[PDB]
Amino acid sequence: GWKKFLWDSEKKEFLGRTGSSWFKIFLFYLIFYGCLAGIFIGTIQVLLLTLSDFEPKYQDRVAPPGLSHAPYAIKTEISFSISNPKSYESFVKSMHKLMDLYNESSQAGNSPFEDCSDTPADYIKRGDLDDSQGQKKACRFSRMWLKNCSGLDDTTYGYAEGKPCVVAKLNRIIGFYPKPLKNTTDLPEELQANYNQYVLPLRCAAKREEDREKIGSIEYFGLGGYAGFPLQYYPYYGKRLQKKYLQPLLAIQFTNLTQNMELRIECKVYGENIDYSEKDRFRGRFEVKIEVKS
Amino acid sequence: DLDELKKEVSMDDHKLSLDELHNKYGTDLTRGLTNARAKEILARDGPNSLTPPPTTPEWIKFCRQLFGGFSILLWIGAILCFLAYGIQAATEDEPANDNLYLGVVLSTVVIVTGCFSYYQEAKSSRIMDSFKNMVPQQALVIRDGEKSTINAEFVVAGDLVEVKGGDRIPADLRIISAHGCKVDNSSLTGESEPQTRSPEFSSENPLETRNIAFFSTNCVEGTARGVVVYTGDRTVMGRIATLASGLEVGRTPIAIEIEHFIHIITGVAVFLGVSFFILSLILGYSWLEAVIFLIGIIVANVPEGLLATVTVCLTLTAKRMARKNCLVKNLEAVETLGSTSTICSDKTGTLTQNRMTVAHMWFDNQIHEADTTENQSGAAFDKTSATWSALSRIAALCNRAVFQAGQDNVPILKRSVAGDASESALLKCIELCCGSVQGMRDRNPKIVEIPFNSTNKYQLSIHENEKSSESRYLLVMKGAPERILDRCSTILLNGAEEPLKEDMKEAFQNAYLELGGLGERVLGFCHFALPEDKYNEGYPFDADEPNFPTTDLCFVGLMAMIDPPRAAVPDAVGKCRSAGIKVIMVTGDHPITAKAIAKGVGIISEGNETIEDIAARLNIPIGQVNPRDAKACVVHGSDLKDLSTEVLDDILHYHTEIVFARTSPQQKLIIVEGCQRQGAIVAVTGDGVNDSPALKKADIGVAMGISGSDVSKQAADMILLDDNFASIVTGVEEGRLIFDNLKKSIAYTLTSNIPEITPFLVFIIGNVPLPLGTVTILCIDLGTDMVPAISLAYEQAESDIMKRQPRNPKTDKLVNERLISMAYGQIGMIQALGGFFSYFVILAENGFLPMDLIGKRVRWDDRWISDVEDSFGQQWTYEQRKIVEFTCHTSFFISIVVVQWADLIICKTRRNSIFQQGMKNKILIFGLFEETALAAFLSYCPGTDVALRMYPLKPSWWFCAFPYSLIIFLYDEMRRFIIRRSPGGWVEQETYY
Amino acid sequence: EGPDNDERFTYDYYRLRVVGLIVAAVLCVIGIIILLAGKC
Numbered sequence A: 001g002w003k004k005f006l007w008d009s010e011k012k013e014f015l016g017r018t019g020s021s022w023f024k025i026f027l028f029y030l031i032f033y034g035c036l037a038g039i040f041i042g043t044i045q046v047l048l049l050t051l052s053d054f055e056p057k058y059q060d061r062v063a064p065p066g067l068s069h070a071p072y073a074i075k076t077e078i079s080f081s082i083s084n085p086k087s088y089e090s091f092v093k094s095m096h097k098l099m100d101l102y103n104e105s106s107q108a109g110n111s112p113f114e115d116c117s118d119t120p121a122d123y124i125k126r127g128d129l130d131d132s133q134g135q136k137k138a139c140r141f142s143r144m145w146l147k148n149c150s151g152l153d154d155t156t157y158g159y160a161e162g163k164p165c166v167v168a169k170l171n172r173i174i175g176f177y178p179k180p181l182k183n184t185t186d187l188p189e190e191l192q193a194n195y196n197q198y199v200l201p202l203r204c205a206a207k208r209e210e211d212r213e214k215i216g217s218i219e220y221f222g223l224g225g226y227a228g229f230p231l232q233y234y235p236y237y238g239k240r241l242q243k244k245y246l247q248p249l250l251a252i253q254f255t256n257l258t259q260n261m262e263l264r265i266e267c268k269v270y271g272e273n274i275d276y277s278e279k280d281r282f283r284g285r286f287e288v289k290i291e292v293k294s
Numbered sequence B: 001d002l003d004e005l006k007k008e009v010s011m012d013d014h015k016l017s018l019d020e021l022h023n024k025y026g027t028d029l030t031r032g033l034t035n036a037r038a039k040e041i042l043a044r045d046g047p048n049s050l051t052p053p054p055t056t057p058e059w060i061k062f063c064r065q066l067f068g069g070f071s072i073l074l075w076i077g078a079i080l081c082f083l084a085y086g087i088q089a090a091t092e093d094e095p096a097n098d099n100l101y102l103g104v105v106l107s108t109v110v111i112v113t114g115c116f117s118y119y120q121e122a123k124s125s126r127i128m129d130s131f132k133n134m135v136p137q138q139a140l141v142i143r144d145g146e147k148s149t150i151n152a153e154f155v156v157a158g159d160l161v162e163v164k165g166g167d168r169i170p171a172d173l174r175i176i177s178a179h180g181c182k183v184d185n186s187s188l189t190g191e192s193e194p195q196t197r198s199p200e201f202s203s204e205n206p207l208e209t210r211n212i213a214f215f216s217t218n219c220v221e222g223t224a225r226g227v228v229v230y231t232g233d234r235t236v237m238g239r240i241a242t243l244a245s246g247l248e249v250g251r252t253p254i255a256i257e258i259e260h261f262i263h264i265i266t267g268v269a270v271f272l273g274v275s276f277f278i279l280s281l282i283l284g285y286s287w288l289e290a291v292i293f294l295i296g297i298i299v300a301n302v303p304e305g306l307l308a309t310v311t312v313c314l315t316l317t318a319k320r321m322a323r324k325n326c327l328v329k330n331l332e333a334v335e336t337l338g339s340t341s342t343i344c345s346d347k348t349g350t351l352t353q354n355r356m357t358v359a360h361m362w363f364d365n366q367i368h369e370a371d372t373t374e375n376q377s378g379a380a381f382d383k384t385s386a387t388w389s390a391l392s393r394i395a396a397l398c399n400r401a402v403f404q405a406g407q408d409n410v411p412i413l414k415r416s417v418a419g420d421a422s423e424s425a426l427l428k429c430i431e432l433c434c435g436s437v438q439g440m441r442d443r444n445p446k447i448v449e450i451p452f453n454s455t456n457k458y459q460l461s462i463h464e465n466e467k468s469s470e471s472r473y474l475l476v477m478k479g480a481p482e483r484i485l486d487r488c489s490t491i492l493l494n495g496a497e498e499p500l501k502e503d504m505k506e507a508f509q510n511a512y513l514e515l516g517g518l519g520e521r522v523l524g525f526c527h528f529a530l531p532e533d534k535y536n537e538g539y540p541f542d543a544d545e546p547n548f549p550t551t552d553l554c555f556v557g558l559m560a561m562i563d564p565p566r567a568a569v570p571d572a573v574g575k576c577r578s579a580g581i582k583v584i585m586v587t588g589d590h591p592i593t594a595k596a597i598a599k600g601v602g603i604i605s606e607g608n609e610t611i612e613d614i615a616a617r618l619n620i621p622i623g624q625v626n627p628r629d630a631k632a633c634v635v636h637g638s639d640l641k642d643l644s645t646e647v648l649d650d651i652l653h654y655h656t657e658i659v660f661a662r663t664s665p666q667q668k669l670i671i672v673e674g675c676q677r678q679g680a681i682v683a684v685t686g687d688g689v690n691d692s693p694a695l696k697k698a699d700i701g702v703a704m705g706i707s708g709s710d711v712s713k714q715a716a717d718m719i720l721l722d723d724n725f726a727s728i729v730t731g732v733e734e735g736r737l738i739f740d741n742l743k744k745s746i747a748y749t750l751t752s753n754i755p756e757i758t759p760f761l762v763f764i765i766g767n768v769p770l771p772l773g774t775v776t777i778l779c780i781d782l783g784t785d786m787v788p789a790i791s792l793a794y795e796q797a798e799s800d801i802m803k804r805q806p807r808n809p810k811t812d813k814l815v816n817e818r819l820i821s822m823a824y825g826q827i828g829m830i831q832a833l834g835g836f837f838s839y840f841v842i843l844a845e846n847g848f849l850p851m852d853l854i855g856k857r858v859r860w861d862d863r864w865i866s867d868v869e870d871s872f873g874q875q876w877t878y879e880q881r882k883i884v885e886f887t888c889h890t891s892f893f894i895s896i897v898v899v900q901w902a903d904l905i906i907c908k909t910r911r912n913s914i915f916q917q918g919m920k921n922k923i924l925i926f927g928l929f930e931e932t933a934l935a936a937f938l939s940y941c942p943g944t945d946v947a948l949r950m951y952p953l954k955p956s957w958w959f960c961a962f963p964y965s966l967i968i969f970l971y972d973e974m975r976r977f978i979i980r981r982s983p984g985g986w987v988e989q990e991t992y993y
Numbered sequence C: 001e002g003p004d005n006d007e008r009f010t011y012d013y014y015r016l017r018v019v020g021l022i023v024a025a026v027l028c029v030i031g032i033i034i035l036l037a038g039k040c
């Protein structure tokens, strides 16, 4: 048994078959699998011929845009000691990774960058989604616009003395026009003052009614000094039609934060084509658990 | 319970005297025992009743059904699933509950299968309990010189016991005085006729002597006395029953096939796991993860639904059997008949009817044959001559037996008749084609009868003649043909009379040897018209002197008789021989009768010859002929007792038509074992207690239902409630049919394996988003798939199944490498490619091209990256990309169903084409329709993306798997074509299951 | 088109589910018909 089914010397068999058999079977499987591979590849090429390079055919799984931020929180919690420096390094490293892309050295010349209104403005259509005109042009977004959180002055961005910052960002969608709420009698309380039509508002608050008191003064930084995103930076023509494109950003400083206690802060954007989800906690809004323990 | 002392052949103290007997057990031959002494012994050793069987509680067999070989594999699978869940709970936070679901599901599968399998064996046990009809019985014992009837349970060793024709022998008696007493030794020893019990001793073998009455036997006619020698379980049939219970059970062929099947499934499962474990450790992953990968791949390679499918498969073929009156106690005993290659049968009660019947008749220098079949389905014998009428008057008058009161309902052959077996057979034949004997008998009044004498060797009687024109006297007499031939001088030829010249005397001698050589017993009937001038109507012929002329009578004709075989016995034996099944007769009857029945049923084909037949045809001694020139052999039991192991092997190895005669039950067991030692499956068909040790050790026992004994009925595996023997042919046919279908269904449930594991393998090696989820694999293996696999059982034959030779056990298996090469190698591969095709299509239409998917799982899974760039530059949140992955699981599952369509069609037939066999199987059609409706239901019903995580599909996706399916169909069609045109070629020894 | 291109982000899943159920139902019935056709 053990020995024979391995190698017998009368029938000159190895494992069961002869020399010419292992070859007939190996050759058959090689030809068979080769044909299988060629067929799968052909059916995948016709699939590549069925899609366009300048636009995703289906854009419904990304209709209501998200609201992400600069720090990378594991459980949406920002916890660090104001004494131990090796505590907020993971935050500054990320923040830096994000702002490191808005460097002026990167944004230079006429191509492919263009100077836009220093004050919020309206949409800008650079034509259709074609290759007729070459690479479209995107508006420049300066670092300095974000005043106390830019890492140009206080590299750390705040985390050094109990005053962290949080750079919010709107998820990039192709052909998406942000639309703000109009001035009519139904509008939230908050939004009434400073209604620049051209600005998509971002306003943070506290999840529970108690926590209001323990969160101090939310100081937002942005284009024009407003707490929102200027409509002039839209729409997005996609990577292929607009490489070197920068999306607006909004900084939020949580000054006067109570020490040694977990604070739940929910930030939210307001607008027509913006809708939230009870299942996805990043669709339009976002949550952060700040705790400056020192 | 020493088995070797129970395996030995019975010994006894028969060869003794009445004084030695009374001196050994202690007993008055004329006064019996004393009541005080009787009770002293009754309390000293135990009542004269066999021990009850070893009761089997129901929770024991329920736990039995919960275990086994397949259910055990599913048990270890559930255990592994919970182990991997524990590790994920103690090692990581937010552990997914996929594994805990899969484990409770596997446990439920095992429990449900156990409940169903247990319920069936209980059903059979209830209908089995409705047959033990036990009416208490009381014996007649003589104590202190008085006759008393006491319960059978109070008889002891030593007292005097009297029996009477119609009662049952209580214990093992030693006859001391008899009065023409006969007993039926059919169940214990196998003797078709009633052996007379005489106080004198005759043979060295206790079963052959006449001075011993046995347990469970019955006294047909006469009365006798005897001293109880053996009592209780220590009796003959007691040692036989105890031996039967103390024999092992075995392990059927279907079970061994399932075991070797699990052997292969685990071989390839632990191979893929230990290998992708070293491979994952070589790619950087940590140990904690690799262990989960090993368990996941091994558990993934376990068929969870093949258990329920196989159980339902086996269950379906058993109902077909219960419809034709063939009941199986276990569930796998349904396949053993088809795999049998050597059937050892019994003669008395199985091959025959154990009822004496008038077979052949002599009259008008011509042999006439009568119908000797249970339901009377045959040829009449020409009832138009006067000779036959006179014969009917002779037999119907010169006969003293009469039907038992109250049989006005049963048929003419199955009713009870009080008398000898010869007068009963004659009475039944006359009552059969001559109408009511009761009026035939009152139509002619019997005046004087001289009973059968040991010296006269004849039975005669005179009666009045019902001729209203002839008032003479009729005289009739029957007896041995030689004695009656010496008393005639005329012959009733075609009605008229003629002299007895030597021409007809020689025709009578050849007729005597013709009916005699047929193994039948012949009798002669003659009559004469007494002259009313010498014996007027008033003269009384008192039975004292010669009042009737002994000689000068008128011989009318001979009448033979023998126990005939059951209706479908010859046809069934022929059908079994046609299927290549060796039929070997094994019986404890006289060889002169066994050989005749063998030739009459087909065991000894007409033309074949024994060594004695050759010595008789040549007129030379038997020690000169060579035994190789003899195809058939008759082995006597006395000679069987003195034979080595090799000799029996050679007996079965050189003789094709074997008949074992005069073999004891222990020898029957030895013969069955001699058949197994080589390597063939054995099926023993019997009825009495002597067959109990033979039916138990055989691979499959078949007991008769009406004519069988309770012990052999409880020790058998299959019961024939109608006593029809053709059911054996039906069984051997179904046993094959249900085998080729299991092969097809297994290849079906194994083909889906590959498109179920490949997604995960490419997930770990290529780092692409998970293609096939867990609740989808479950919706495939335990949902859609079940109905089609169950339907594959309803497939009809392709070629004649009752024509091919029996499957070789050592080479043709149930699951070979030729199947694995198809399911795991060729079809499953195409199905996996089709699934991946639909996958890439879904992700390419939403924005994730194939070049950007390789290398993303680390960020595609991360729960905190709300900005994942796709091939076009769009930013996708975490929940948004997860919805697409789930929709990819839904379409992958639908692709599986689409390719399963062509797999269920190419699995329908193994060799033949679809345009030949045909889609006449309505269940398979229903399986396809339902399989599609369920997939559409699981995707389109609201709240499924919440409960099961399956999102709706856009109508253009459903068509991504169609080309792969058509290709599967064309490939298998050309496959099943070269096999037909090219028999024995490469495609056959490489791809033919 | 232009600014009010809201349709480019909408899909009528409702109507799709309704139709897919109608179809599933029909296939289910047909199945039953085939299964019991002969036992009557």
Ligand SMILES: *[C@@H]1O[C@H](CO[C@@H]2O[C@@H](C)[C@@H](O)[C@@H](O)[C@@H]2O)[C@@H](O[C@@H]2O[C@H](CO)[C@@H](O[C@@H]3O[C@H](CO[C@H]4O[C@H](CO)[C@@H](O)[C@H](O)[C@@H]4O)[C@@H](O)[C@H](O[C@H]4O[C@H](CO)[C@@H](O)[C@H](O)[C@@H]4O)[C@@H]3O)[C@H](O)[C@H]2NC(C)=O)[C@H](O)[C@H]1NC(C)=O
Pocket (backbone or CB within 6 Å): A100, A101, A103, A105, A106, A151, A152, A155
């Ligand atoms: C985008 O801008 C980033 C900042 O640019 C600076 O400020 C802008 C406004 C301009 O003025 C520009 O010209 C400036 O450079 C730019 O990142 C910067 O890159 C330089 C070059 O590597 C870094 O300088 C090095 O600093 C380290 C120590 O850094 C400490 O502070 C930083 C935070 O600022 C911490 O992250 C560190 O852990 C340290 O705590 C020095 O040790 C190092 O020494 C090297 O140079 C000296 C000579 O000066 C040599 O003798 C040595 O051998 C070394 O070769 C450098 O001095 C600078 O830290 C870094 N800034 C930040 C904030 O990290 C970024 O690269 C730009 N990106 C793109 C894509 O354009």
Ligand SMILES: CCCCCCCC/C=C\CCCCCCCC(=O)OC[C@H](COP(=O)(O)OCC[N+](C)(C)C)OC(=O)CCCCCCC/C=C\CCCCCCCC
Pocket (backbone or CB within 6 Å): A015, A016, A026, B264, B268, B272, B758, B761, B762, B765, B810, B811, B813, B815, B816, B817, B820, B824, B825
């Ligand atoms: C991300 C990538 C995806 C990866 C997916 C992988 C999916 C896995 C798919 C298939 C699993 C394959 C595993 C091997 C299966 C072998 C089947 C097997 O073991 O079945 C058992 C048979 C027994 O059969 P029986 O009962 O009829 O025997 C009767 C003998 N009597 C009667 C004479 C006594 O035993 C035999 O066949 C004898 C054993 C023969 C073993 C051959 C081993 C070949 C394995 C690999 C070869 C690779 C080489 C590649 C290089 C080629 C050169 C270019």
Ligand SMILES: CCCCCCCC/C=C\CCCCCCCC(=O)OC[C@H](COP(=O)(O)OCC[N+](C)(C)C)OC(=O)CCCCCCC/C=C\CCCCCCCC
Pocket (backbone or CB within 6 Å): B901, B902, B905, B914, B915, B916, B917, B918, B919, B920, B925, B928, B929, B932, B962, B963, B965, B966, B969, C027
């Ligand atoms: C691009 C897309 C790729 C898709 C690939 C997957 C395809 C798989 C699905 C279907 C394949 C269909 C194959 C068609 C085969 C037809 C064969 C045929 O017709 O052979 C004729 C037979 C032979 O007759 P005979 O001479 O032996 O008769 C003797 C009568 N005497 C005895 C009285 C004389 O006749 C008979 O079988 C009797 C009549 C039977 C009629 C059957 C009709 C039903 C056929 C298919 C059902 C549809 C399933 C659809 C599944 C989708 C669900 C949504």
Ligand SMILES: CCCCCCCC/C=C\CCCCCCCC(=O)OC[C@H](COP(=O)(O)OCC[N+](C)(C)C)OC(=O)CCCCCCC/C=C\CCCCCCCC
Pocket (backbone or CB within 6 Å): A279, B941, B942, B943, B944, B946, B947, B948
């Ligand atoms: C011969 C014999 C023939 C017999 C044929 C029988 C066929 C039976 C056919 C149909 C009955 C199927 C069951 C019906 C289920 C109704 C569920 C329902 O009406 O849900 C409506 C609501 C959805 O509301 P919404 O849109 O506001 O939710 C918004 C949620 N947001 C916004 C958070 C995402 O549900 C919810 O909320 C909660 C959802 C609860 C989930 C229940 C689903 C059950 C799960 C598995 C069982 C399926 C096993 C397969 C059996 C196959 C049998 C053949």
Ligand SMILES: CCCCCCCC/C=C\CCCCCCCC(=O)OC[C@H](COP(=O)(O)OCC[N+](C)(C)C)OC(=O)CCCCCCC/C=C\CCCCCCCC
Pocket (backbone or CB within 6 Å): B101, B775, B778, B779, B782, B783, B784, B946, B947, B948
């Ligand atoms: C004859 C033909 C038969 C055809 C039938 C097809 C056979 C199906 C075979 C296997 C499928 C069974 C697998 C069971 C899956 C259970 C999944 C489960 O328990 O998931 C737990 C989820 C939790 O999810 P999460 O963490 O995302 O929640 C986050 C919530 N936050 C974030 C808002 C807090 O809770 C929920 O979904 C809550 C809703 C609970 C839904 C239970 C549905 C049970 C479905 C089937 C069981 C009965 C089948 C019996 C039929 C056998 C047929 C032979």
Ligand SMILES: CCCCCCCC/C=C\CCCCCCCC(=O)OC[C@H](COP(=O)(O)OCC[N+](C)(C)C)OC(=O)CCCCCCC/C=C\CCCCCCCC
Pocket (backbone or CB within 6 Å): B954, B955, B956, C011, C012, C015, C016, C019, C023
């Ligand atoms: C022998 C076995 C026989 C088996 C027969 C089984 C019976 C089959 C039962 C039903 C199938 C018919 C289904 C018809 C449904 C049409 C419904 C409809 O209105 O659907 C429109 C969609 C277009 O969707 P969209 O995404 O463009 O718009 C989405 C727009 N929103 C989402 C905004 C609303 O279209 C679709 O679903 C296309 C529907 C699929 C088209 C049917 C293709 C038939 C394929 C082969 C048969 C060829 C037979 C040749 C005859 C030979 C005779 C000898």
Ligand SMILES: CCCCCCCC/C=C\CCCCCCCC(=O)OC[C@H](COP(=O)(O)OCC[N+](C)(C)C)OC(=O)CCCCCCC/C=C\CCCCCCCC
Pocket (backbone or CB within 6 Å): B913, B915, B970, B973, B974, B977, B980, B981
């Ligand atoms: C993209 C391409 C689409 C093409 C569509 C083509 C459709 C063609 C339509 C019908 C096919 C023709 C009808 C065939 C009737 C043949 C009748 C016959 O007498 O046959 C007998 C021969 C077998 O002879 P033998 O010597 O081996 O017998 C040996 C017997 N012994 C072993 C006892 C000695 O049978 C054979 O050769 C059968 C071998 C036929 C293999 C060809 C399979 C064609 C593939 C698909 C058909 C379409 C069905 C599915 C519909 C999908 C709709 C979307």
Ligand SMILES: CCCCCCCC/C=C\CCCCCCCC(=O)OC[C@H](COP(=O)(O)OCC[N+](C)(C)C)OC(=O)CCCCCCC/C=C\CCCCCCCC
Pocket (backbone or CB within 6 Å): A024, A027, A028, A031, A032, A035, A036, A039, A040, B830, B833, B964, B967, B968, B970, B971, B974, B975, B978, B984, B985, B986, B987, B989
């Ligand atoms: C998306 C999925 C697509 C899948 C498509 C798969 C297509 C690939 C199909 C077949 C390619 C494999 C061809 C292999 C040829 C080399 C094999 C070889 O070296 O073989 C040698 C033998 C000759 O040796 P011997 O027997 O004389 O020696 C006796 C020796 N002793 C005793 C061991 C028997 O060869 C022979 O016997 C001849 C046997 C040749 C094998 C015929 C198999 C044909 C199967 C399928 C073709 C149909 C494609 C239909 C597709 C329609 C697409 C729309």
Ligand SMILES: CCCCCCCC/C=C\CCCCCCCC(=O)OC[C@H](COP(=O)(O)OCC[N+](C)(C)C)OC(=O)CCCCCCC/C=C\CCCCCCCC
Pocket (backbone or CB within 6 Å): B933, B934, B937, B941, B942, C013, C014, C017, C018, C021, C022, C024, C025, C028, C029, C032
């Ligand atoms: C012997 C002869 C036998 C014959 C038997 C015939 C049986 C009857 C046959 C067919 C009945 C058809 C019923 C059609 C029901 C339409 C319901 C429907 O279209 O509901 C759709 C909407 C949910 O849309 P959504 O906006 O949430 O979409 C998600 C959007 N997102 C995720 C993007 C946000 O519903 C809702 O809101 C409210 C839903 C309320 C619950 C409705 C329950 C329907 C469930 C099962 C019935 C279907 C069984 C069919 C038979 C199949 C047998 C296997």
Ligand SMILES: C[C@@H]1O[C@@H](O[C@H]2C[C@@H](O)[C@]3(CO)[C@H]4[C@H](O)C[C@]5(C)[C@@H](C6=CC(=O)OC6)CC[C@]5(O)[C@@H]4CC[C@]3(O)C2)[C@H](O)[C@H](O)[C@H]1O
Pocket (backbone or CB within 6 Å): B084, B088, B096, B098, B099, B102, B289, B292, B293, B296, B297, B299, B300, B760, B773, B774, B777, B778, B861
């Ligand atoms: C690399 C690794 O990937 C992820 O985990 C992976 C391992 C493990 O977690 C599971 C869930 O337990 C596995 C499980 O083991 C085996 C399966 C039950 C298996 C079977 C189907 C079947 O029928 O029988 C067996 C096929 C895949 C499977 O269905 C799941 C799929 C989800 C996954 O989650 C994947 C996590 O992201 C993890 O954090 C990261 O380390």
Ligand SMILES: *[C@@H]1O[C@H](CO)[C@@H](O[C@@H]2O[C@H](CO)[C@@H](O)[C@H](O)[C@H]2NC(C)=O)[C@H](O)[C@H]1NC(C)=O
Pocket (backbone or CB within 6 Å): A216, A217, A256
């Ligand atoms: C920041 O919060 C502090 C409280 O932590 C506020 O200062 C307190 O004001 C009360 C009077 O209302 C005094 O009794 C406390 O002594 C003050 N505490 C400190 C530490 O100054 C302060 O007004 C808040 N400032 C802003 C801008 O919100």
Ligand SMILES: CC(C)CCC[C@@H](C)[C@H]1CC[C@H]2[C@@H]3CC=C4C[C@@H](O)CC[C@]4(C)[C@H]3CC[C@]12C
Pocket (backbone or CB within 6 Å): A035, A038, A039, A041, A042, A045
């Ligand atoms: C019936 C079977 C054997 C035919 C299989 C044909 C195979 C070999 C054919 C079908 C489609 C073909 C591919 C189609 C498209 C491309 C893209 C091009 O930029 C390079 C060649 C490449 C990659 C082809 C290579 C060969 C290919 C895969």
Ligand SMILES: CC(C)CCC[C@@H](C)[C@H]1CC[C@H]2[C@@H]3CC=C4C[C@@H](O)CC[C@]4(C)[C@H]3CC[C@]12C
Pocket (backbone or CB within 6 Å): B932, B936, B955, B956, B958, C016, C019, C020, C023, C024
């Ligand atoms: C015997 C063979 C050839 C029949 C093949 C029938 C196929 C083509 C049928 C069976 C089930 C059908 C699908 C069932 C359900 C739906 C959902 C509906 O909203 C659009 C049509 C769509 C997507 C159907 C398209 C055609 C389909 C896939």
Ligand SMILES: [Mg+2]
Pocket (backbone or CB within 6 Å): B186, B190, B346, B347, B348, B349, B350, B686, B687, B688
């Ligand atoms: Mg018998």
Ligand SMILES: [Mg+2]
Pocket (backbone or CB within 6 Å): B249, B250, B695, B696, B697, B698, B699, B700, B701, B716, B717
């Ligand atoms: Mg048995």
Ligand SMILES: [Mg+2]
Pocket (backbone or CB within 6 Å): B300, B302, B303, B304, B753, B756, B781
């Ligand atoms: Mg499986």
